[PDB]
């Protein structure tokens, strides 16, 4: 039985025609205190997978070490470690999903919500979620925390079902993700302006973008707002 201390907020993601996009802000909250501002919550595994993690940061750092160790262990006695027998997103996910459910069953969970985004060896897009309860699900769009409430509605307007994926380009998909991150900065009290974004394409590969900022924000209309009702001045 735990309680989360230093926490990370929403992780959002979606599929597009050739691959997947995933994003998450760089904040490490300590309750209401916005304590740490240089936290990377997107962790690449190889050149074909990115794991986005929210929840407890100490448990996130533990998972980082497991994935780091997984790459090492896979390389052992494996001449095709950088080829046919490289780590797939589906392998990495199933490993984590096994761990998450084992820990909840021992009543000592890893207090996290995880999204594994990647591209398989056959070109298929991989996007699947797992959390502290060991609950798993997949969808064209996936998000954690506040992202589930605010991002998914926006991302589902772009890709509402499976047939909408081939029709969605990387330019359109990235635009929707960046818009969603802005909306979260407006409305999530444990979010930050700075964030990271990752694209895993079946042609261009892994593109990891750091130090992004939310921009083109609408604040001007605030100047006209007075009191809470009757106040004219």
């Amino acid at each position: 039985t735990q309680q989360p201390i230093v926490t990370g907020t929403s992780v959002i993601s979606m599929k597009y025609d050739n691959g997947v996009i995933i994003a998450a802000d760089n904040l490490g909250s300590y309750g209401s205190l916005l304590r740490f501002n240089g936290v990377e919550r997107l962790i690449p595994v190889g050149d074909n997978t990115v794991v986005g993690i929210s929840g407890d940061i100490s448990d996130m750092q533990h998972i980082e070490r497991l994935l780091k160790d997984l790459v090492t262990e896979n390389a052992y006695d494996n001449p095709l470690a950088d080829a046919e027998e490289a780590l797939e997103p589906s392998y990495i996910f199933e490993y984590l999903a096994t761990v998450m459910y084992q820990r909840r069953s021992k009543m000592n969970p890893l207090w996290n919500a995880i999204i594994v985004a990647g591209v398989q060896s056959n070109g298929d897009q991989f996007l699947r979620y797992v959390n502290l309860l060991g609950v798993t699900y997949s969808s064209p769009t996936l998000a954690t925390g506040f992202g589930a409430h605010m991002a998914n509605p926006l991302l589902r307007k772009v890709v509402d079902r499976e047939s909408d994926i081939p029709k969605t380009t990387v330019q359109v998909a990235e635009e929707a993700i960046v818009n969603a991150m802005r909306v979260l900065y407006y409305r999530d009290a444990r979010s930050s302006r700075n964030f990271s974004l990752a694209i895993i394409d079946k042609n261009t590969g892994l593109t990891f973008k750091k130090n992004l900022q939310v921009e083109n924000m609408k604040w001007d209309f605030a100047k006209d707002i007075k009191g809470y009702g009757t106040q004219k001045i």
Binding site: H149, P153, L154, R187, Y228, G229
Partner: protein, 222 residues
């Protein structure tokens, strides 16, 4: 529930879904969450269904009497003040979360009231279980100097976000447009994107299927 309010050029528009729940069960598939306080002051309600209805009727009654007393068309701030003082008095036990809007001699207005009696002001607002789905849309597409047709679209789009993505919201979209200098138009079932598909079979029973023990004529007359 999912409810919104949006300001535009010459007035204000409010909208709502039409689902009513009792646990995980849908009690009413086409309920009316848009309430008339006065002819040109309408209220969208989320929370405890009976509270939103009763509190809106009570203040609407007192507003009518006030309008008759003062020989003036009622103001939105009067409804806002009366509602918030009533709700505050009951310390949140009357679970009404309202979006109050309307036009009056002062202009066009848009407010929100919480159950505990706190009021907000804004150009676009959303309340209820699907308020986060709706506000995501409003924050994405809202802009200054909206037209009437643009505001109705934005409002109904915000409600749709709740209908599809929130389990506490569903069925149809109701709208009410309050423009300055015009009558307020109440658009009941403005959108109906959740029509039930034809059933595969008719379950009309053969007459005599049900076993009966007694029969009798009931007297309803005097």
């Amino acid at each position: 529930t999912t409810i919104v309010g949006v300001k535009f050029n010459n007035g204000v528009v409010i909208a709502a879904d039409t689902r009513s729940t009792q646990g995980p069960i849908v009690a009413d598939k086409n309920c009316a969450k848009l309430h008339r306080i006065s002819p040109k002051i309408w209220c969208a309600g989320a929370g405890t269904a009976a509270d939103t209805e009763a509190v809106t009727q009570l203040i609407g009654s007192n507003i009518e009497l006030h309008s008759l007393y003062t020989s003036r068309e009622p103001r939105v701030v009067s409804a806002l003040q009366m509602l918030k003082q009533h709700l505050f008095k009951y310390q949140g036990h009357i679970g009404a979360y309202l979006i109050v809007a309307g036009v009056d001699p002062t202009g066009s207005h848009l407010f929100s009231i919480h159950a505990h009696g706190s009021t907000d002001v804004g150009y676009y607002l959303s309340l209820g279980s699907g308020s986060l789905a709706a506000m995501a849309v409003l924050e994405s597409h809202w802009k200054q100097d909206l037209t009437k047709e643009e505001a109705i679209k934005l409002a109904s789009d915000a409600i749709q976000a709740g209908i599809w993505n929130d389990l506490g919201s569903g069925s149809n979209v109701d709208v009410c447009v309050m423009e300055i200098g015009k009558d307020a138009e109440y658009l009941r079932n403005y959108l109906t994107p959740n029509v039930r598909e034809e059933k595969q079979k008719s379950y009309k029973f053969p007459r005599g299927t049900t076993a009966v023990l007694k029969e009798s004529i009931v007297n309803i007359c005097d």
